[PDB]
Write a protein that binds this ligand. Structure first.
Ligand SMILES: CCCCCCN(c1ccc(C(O)(C(F)(F)F)C(F)(F)F)cc1)S(=O)(=O)c1ccccc1
Ligand SMILES: CCCCCCN(c1ccc(C(O)(C(F)(F)F)C(F)(F)F)cc1)S(=O)(=O)c1ccccc1
Lengths: 290, 292
């Protein structure tokens, strides 16, 4: 029940996702691992305690390495997983950049608007991809050999749900979205006309409307159950909440970087720590081939 | 009580143990860890059998409070069965160096020909290491507590019964049940070290006499420092454990040689101790270690 222009849009996005989402994380290697002014710290310790995960590294041989993090005994021990987290995030950001590069509507845009769109949506598209590997029953992101498990708390669900990034994950997972709906959410978030720096506002706004129309038409053609009533509007509301979480995450990251520098060079360009001149890695990655 | 020469014998051995047994393993660093990655096929079948016993998980408690844990892989095609061998060799070599230092600080051992010192260390190195490992063994948790490192036996099947089939696990459990004192542990080490019937020993009667005096001291220590109508046969129980330990030593040498043939892993010190390719010129690391 979709137009062939909508049908080609969906499969160009789904082919893009297949080519640029390493769902098994097989090509992620050479990552750092945990080893074997006063007012600021209180905020930073809060920002990092709400995201207390354990790491499981499985080997092709069948062996398993497990890392339980250090409990809060003050400081410098709260930054144990930060180097690894910056390596994984940079790897995901590169996959997001490659995702946008192979989409025709994105590469046909000015390189400065391509930089502005990727700076505003990198975190958001990374969360959408991570939701597809999130296990809500075990609170674990299953990333191939790497698994990230939320540490059990006495609060019990309620405490974790006070973290907005976690409740987004549990609520988006509850919608039980298809692959096509996640990749249309990625396109709608990527082609955001009101991101800082964007110049071709109308061009991007017109592109965003077509993606949103395609998603509404896809849902109408494949999800007629009462469980999926108002699903399109729920997804659009979820995307609005994701934009709010994105702004919070940028503020958290800048606060941690000020007291403990950890960001990779690509994260510094994406989070603001001649656009093309200030964003050389992004400029090089976007001129490179897919 | 004990004769004055017997008390000084225990004091030299205790002084030996204190100076050379890193009971917290604080100085065991820079060790390798498992990574995050026709007729010879009859040799491979024997080695698979040789390496199933070593179902141990490794735990690394960090200074910050973090914990790293390692489940060994299940035997598949092969090679993964050798994942813990580099680490185990580093630990064995570290323990072997502490055993050589123990023998070096004993007067009765230094006054022997260097070639008999080497022959005794080649025959008893594994046994003295197991005796020291028993003192850090927790029978209730099946875990060797080596400071920040822990080696926990993985529940293979039934459990206690299936594990007690491996002679070395049985040894650790039976020896731990005797609840020996530090002085009795160190006297076991001396009796095992001064064994006259080790391959290559020449001064057999001097070594045999030295072993008898250590055994008499241990027998006298038990009669004078333990409730006697209860520990009547503890000395004889200890001697039977040492006899079984000598048998387990020979099984381990054969197991180790079989693995080394198809998968070399032994450190240079292990190669000299286990005969992997005159006595002075073939044992030069041991020679330097015994002559500082
Ligand atoms: C540290 C808690 C991880 C889970 C919490 C939510 N996730 C997240 C985590 C950290 C960031 C950081 O930017 C921050 F500084 F905020 F910690 C980073 F630098 F550490 F990476 C961003 C998103 S997650 O994407 O789902 C994700 C990321 C890596 C592995 C699995 C899942
Ligand atoms: C295969 C024999 C198993 C005997 C019981 C297990 N132990 C053991 C394991 C391997 C060896 C080897 O010699 C072998 F060749 F068998 F593989 C070594 F080279 F790997 F180190 C020796 C003793 S342990 O004493 O309890 C020990 C050693 C180091 C750290 C913690 C515990």
């Amino acid at each position: 029940g979709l137009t062939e222009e909508q049908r080609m849009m969906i499969r160009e996005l789904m082919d893009a996702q297949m080519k640029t989402f390493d769902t098994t994380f097989s090509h992620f290697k050479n990552f750092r691992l945990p080893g074997v002014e006063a007012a600021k710290w209180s905020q930073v310790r809060k920002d990092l305690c709400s995201l207390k995960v354990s790491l499981q590294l499985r080997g092709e041989d069948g062996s398993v390495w497990n890392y339980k993090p250090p409990a809060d005994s003050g400081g410098k021990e709260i930054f144990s997983l930060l180097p690894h987290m910056a390596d994984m995030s940079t790897y995901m950001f590169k996959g997001i950049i490659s995702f946008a590069k192979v989409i025709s509507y994105f590469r046909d845009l000015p390189i400065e608007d391509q930089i502005s769109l990727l700076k505003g949506a990198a975190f958001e598209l990374c969360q959408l991809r991570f939701n597809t590997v999130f296990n809500a029953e075990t609170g674990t992101w299953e990333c191939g050999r790497l698994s990230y498990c939320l540490e059990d708390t006495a609060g019990g669900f309620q405490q974790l749900l006070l973290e907005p990034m976690l409740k987004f994950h549990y609520m988006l997972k509850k919608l039980q979205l298809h692959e096509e709906e996640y990749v249309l959410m990625q396109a709608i978030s990527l082609f955001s006309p009101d991101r800082p720096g964007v110049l071709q506002h109308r061009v991007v706004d017109q592109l965003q409307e077509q993606f949103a129309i395609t998603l509404k038409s896809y849902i109408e053609c494949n999800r007629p159950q009462p469980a999926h009533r108002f699903l399109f509007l729920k997804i659009m509301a979820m995307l609005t909440e994701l934009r709010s979480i994105n702004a919070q995450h940028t503020q958290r990251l800048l606060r941690i970087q000020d007291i403990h520098p950890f960001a990779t060079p690509l994260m510094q360009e994406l989070f603001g720590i001649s656009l093309t001149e200030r964003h050389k890695i992004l400029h090089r990655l976007l001129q490179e081939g897919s």
